[model samples]
Target: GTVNWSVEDIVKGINSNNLESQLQATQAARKLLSREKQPPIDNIIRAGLIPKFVSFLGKTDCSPIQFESAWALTNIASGTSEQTKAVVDGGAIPAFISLLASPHAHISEQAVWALGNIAGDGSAFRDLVIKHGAIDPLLALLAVPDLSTLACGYLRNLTWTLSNLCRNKNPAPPLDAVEQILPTLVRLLHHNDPEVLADSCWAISYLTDGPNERIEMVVKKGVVPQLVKLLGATELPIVTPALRAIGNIVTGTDEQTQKVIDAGALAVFPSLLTNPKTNIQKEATWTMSNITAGRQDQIQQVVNHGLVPFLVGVLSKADFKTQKEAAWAITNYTSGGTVEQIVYLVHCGIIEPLMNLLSAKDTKIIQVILDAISNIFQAAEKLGETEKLSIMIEECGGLDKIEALQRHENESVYKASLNLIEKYFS
Candidate 1:
C-alpha cells in the first residue's frame, strides 16, 4: 500500500535494474491512480515516474511489465486535462499505438484503453492521437475475426477508443477518414457485446453531429436502418447512444430525417418514448422532436403513429429538461403542421399542459408554450372547436396567465400574449 510508499520508492522501483521493481512500481502507481480518492497525480509526475512507466512499453519481451505500464498510464490518462497532458507531453501516444499491434492481446487492449482516455481528454489531445497514425491500427482490429465473438474484450476497447476519437472532434472529420470506416462502425452496431454496440452508436452520433454535409454522409452510408435496429437493444446504454445518433442525423435536411423515419423509427417510438430512464427518454424525445420538426408529411407520419399521448405526457409531467424537449416538439409540429395535424395535437390533450406550463419561468419554455397555445387556438378556430378550447382555457385560468404575460419583459412573449388577447381573451 501507498501508506508506506513515497515518490522516491515509486521512482526507484520504476527505474531499478530489477524488472520486477518496474512492474511493481507501475502496479502501485496504478492502484493509487485508481483510488476513489486519488493521490496527488501532479506530485507523482513531479517525481518523474511517468516517463519511466512509459519506457516499459518498449520492453516487448516483458509482457507483464508492458501491461502494467500501459495500465498505469491508462489510469493517468483518465485524469484531468492537465494530468493527461503530462502523459501526452511525455510522448506516450506512439508507444501506446505500437502496443496496439502487440501479440499479447492484453497489452493491445490496455493500449487502446489508455488512448481512449487521452483522446477523451479534449480535442487537441485527441487530434494528437489522430496525427500519430492511431486510426489505421485501431480500425484494423475491427476486422479481426468475428467482432461479435464473446471474449474479444480487445475489440471493445479498440472500438471505444475509436469512438472517443470520433467524438470530441469539433466539426467532424473529412469524409475521407470517416468513409473508410463507416461500414465497419455500422456493422458493429449489431455486435453481441453491448459495450461495442454502444460505442459504435456513439461514434456514428459524433460523425453525424457536424454540418449537413457530414450528416448526409452518414445517411448516404445507409446506416439509418442499422441504427434503428440498435434502438431495439434491451440495454439502455445501447439504446441511448443509438437514439442520440439518430437524433443528430435527423437534424439534417428533410431527406436525411425522412430516411430515419422510413427505416421504421416510428414503430419503436412508443416504447422508447416511455422508457424508464430519463436520459433514454430525453434522447428519444429529442429524436421525436426533430422528426416532428421535419416537413408536413413527416409531422403527420409521427402524429399518425399515435405518439401524441406519449408526447403530451412528457410535456405535462416529465422532468424539466425533457419537458423542454416535448414543448419544442409540439412547437415544431404546430409551427409547420397542417391544420389537421395541429387539430390532432389539441385532440391529444395538448391544451391543458400548454396552459399548465405558462407559470414556468424559463424564457425558452414560455416562448414555446405560447407558440403552441397560439397555434392551437388557430387550429381550433379553423375546426370550429374554438368555443370548447376557449372554455377549457378559461376553466384552467389560462386567460389570466396570458394577461399576466402582457407585462413580460420579453417582446416575443408580450406579443404572443397580445395576440392571444386580441384573438380570444379580449
Candidate 2:
C-alpha cells in the first residue's frame, strides 16, 4: 500500500484541520501500527501521538476520530506496562470512559478495548480507573438491552476488563466495586458467546478469590448454579474458570462449600478427578481437597460420592501435584472425617498408598502424609480393635517406610515418625 509511507509521514498529514486528511492519516497510521510485530511505542510516543490521540478520542461524535484515536490508544497501551503509562499521563482514562455510551457500538467497543490495557497494565492504574467510576457507565453500556449481535465484542472486552480490575488478590476491588459487577457477571454467565462466558466466569473467580465474606457475596447473587452448569463445559476456557469460581467458593466457609455442593458440584467433582487432562485433574483434586476439610456432613457428602478411593489412588499414582493436593484432602478428611468415615478411608485401603508415599522426597508432603497416617492410626487405636491395623500396614510395607523416615532431614516428619513408632509400633 506504500512506497515510503511511515508513522512520521502519517503524523505530518494528521497536522491538518481537515477531517479527510485527519481520517486518512490515522487510517494509514493504524495500519502502520498494526503491521509491526511489536508496537513501536518508541516511534509512536516520540512523535508525541499519544496526547494528540487522547484529545481526538475525547471528541466522541459518532465519527471516525474516536474510532481511530481509540484504536491507536489501545495498541499503545497494549505495549509494555511501562509504556502504558504514557496514555494515562496523556489523560485518556476519562476520555475512554466518556466513549462508553457512544451511539455506535464500534466506538464503545474500541473505548473499552483501550481502557482494557490501561487498567490491565498497572495495579495502581486498575484502581485509578475503578476509582474514577468506570463501573456504572460501563454497566450502562452492558445494560443496553442487546436483544442482538452488534455489541457482543464490546461485551467480551468489557467482561475481561472488569476481570483485570478485580484481580490483584492483595487488594481486591472493594466489595462494593465487586458487588456492582456480580449481577452483570451472573447475566454474562448466561450469555451464549463462549468468549463472554469464559471471561465473565474469570471475573467472578477474581471477585470470589478473597475472603469468605467475598465468597458469600457471589453466592447471594444466585450465581452458583449457572457457574456449576459450566463445570461440565467441553471447552477448557469455559470449564477452567468455572472450576476456579466454584473452587474458590468451596474454599470459603463449610456452609459456602455446602452451597456449591447443593448446586450439585459433588456430582461433577468425580468426573473431573478422572479427567484425562492433567490441568483438569489437578484443579479437580485441589477443589476436592478443600471440600474434604469441611465438617462431618460435608465429609459424608464426599463419602457417598465415592471420592475417597479415587483420591487414595491419586495420592499414590497421580502426578506430584495431584499427590500433594490429594495429600491435603486425605489429611483433612482424616481430621474431619468422623470415626465412621475415617474407618471408611481405612476400608478403602489407604495404607498401601500412604506406605508407598513415604519414599517421596518433598519434605512438606512427607510432613503432611505422615500427619495423615498419624491421624488415621490414632483413629484406628480409638476404635480399640486395631490389631489388624498394625499387621495390615506391616504387610503393606508401612514398617520399613516409617523407619526410613526416622533419619530424614526434615525434623517435623522425622519426629512425627518417631512419635508414631513409639506409640503404635514399639
Candidate 3:
C-alpha cells in the first residue's frame, strides 16, 4: 500500500534503497512537480537529484523511472535562470537523446518535447541537439501514428533546427539527408492533427526558401488543400508560417492555382479579403494573387465575390507589401471576361488605386499589374468583339508603353506572358 512520505524521506528512499524503491521515489517526485506550490522543491529535484538520475542511465532496466525523471527534468527545465542551467548541465543532452529509442512511447515523447523546449530558446544547445542525429528520429516520428501532439512539438524544434543549420554560415547536413526527409515532411502536411500538420507545413516552407527543383517537389505532393485549410482557419501568431508555406508552394507552374480551382479553394478565400483583421486581409490577399495566377476565366467569380472594391478601399493607406500583393491579385483577377467586369472594376474606381501602385516603390506591384494588362489583351481573342477589346486596351492603357521587366529577375513571368499573348495572336 502507498504511504505518505516527506520530500527528504523520499530523497533518502531513493538514495538508500534497491531499484524498485528508487523507481517509486522517481514516480513520487514526478507527481510533485505538478503540485503548483512546490516550486522550490521542483528546483531541488532538477539540481539535487536530476544529475544522479541521469548518472544512473544504462545502470539498470529502469527506463520508466528514468523517463519520469527526464520528464520532471523537462517540466522544470522550462523554468528560467539557475534551474535551467542545472538541468542542462546535469547531462541532459546525451541522456535525453538515448531515450529517443526507449521502448516506452511516453518516454520517447517526453524526450522529444524536452529537447524541443530546451532547443527553442535559440541557444547553443539547439546546434548541439541537431548534431546528435536529431533529424532521423524526428522524421521517423512524423509517420508514426498516435503521437500527434508530441510530433507537433518535435517538428517545431525540427523546423527551428533545420532553419538554423541550413542558413548561410551554419554547417548543415548532407543535401541527400534533406532530399530523404523532405518527402515524409510533405506527407505530414495531411496529418490528422492540426498542430502537426501546421508544423510540418511550416518546416517544409522554411526549407524551400531557395527556389530550387526541391521546392517544386513539395508543391507536387498534393498538400494544397491542407495548406489552404490552415491559411483560412489559423490566427495571427500562426498565420505567418501558413502564409509562407502557401507562398512557397505557389511560386511557379500555376500548379497551386490549378489545384485551388480543382479543389474549390477560391470559394472560401475571398471573404477574408474583407476580414476586419488587417493581417488576415493582407495574407489572404497575397495568397489569392498566387492562387488566381492569370486565368481570364477566373476573374468573374473574384469580382462577383467583392474582391475589387475591398482591395481598392485599402490601396491609399495600405503598406507596400499589402499594396503589392493586392496589385498582383487584382492583375490576375481583372483579366478580361465580359467587358462588364473590366467596366465594373474601373467604374468601381480600381484603376485609380492600381495606377497609384504604379508609382509605388515595390517593383513587384508594377510587374504584376503589367502582367494583368497582358492577360486582359489575351482575353480579347475569346471576346470576338474587336470594339470591346479596343476600348479596354486603348482606354485602360493596357498597352501603354512601359519599361521591359528585368531580364534575369522575371524570365519565368516574361515567358508565361509571352507564350500567352502569342497564343492569342496566333
Ranking 1 against 3 by lDDT, winner? 1
lDDT of 2 by residue, 138-246 (tens): 8776665662454666667888887777777556677778878788778878888889889988888888887899889888989899999999888889999999999
Order the candidate numbers by lDDT, best to worst: 1, 2, 3
Which 10 consecutive residues of model 1 have the lowest summed lDDT?
Answer: 168-177
lDDT of each: 0.83, 0.82, 0.61
- Judge candidate 1 against the unseen true structure and give its global Cα lDDT, from 0 to 1: 0.83
Tell me the deviation in Å of residue 239 in model 1: 1.4
Number of the top-ranking candidate, with lDDT as the measure:
1
Scored by lDDT, model 2 comes in at 0.82
TM-score of predicted structure 2: 0.94
Candidate closer to the true structure by TM-score (higher is better), 1 or 3 = 1
Error of 2 at 293 (Å): 0.8
Candidate 1 colliding pairs, count: 0
lDDT string, candidate 3, 266-357, tens digits: 66565666666777678767876765554555566566566667767666556567777777666756553456666566567665455455
| TM-score of each predicted structure versus truth | 0.91, 0.94, 0.58
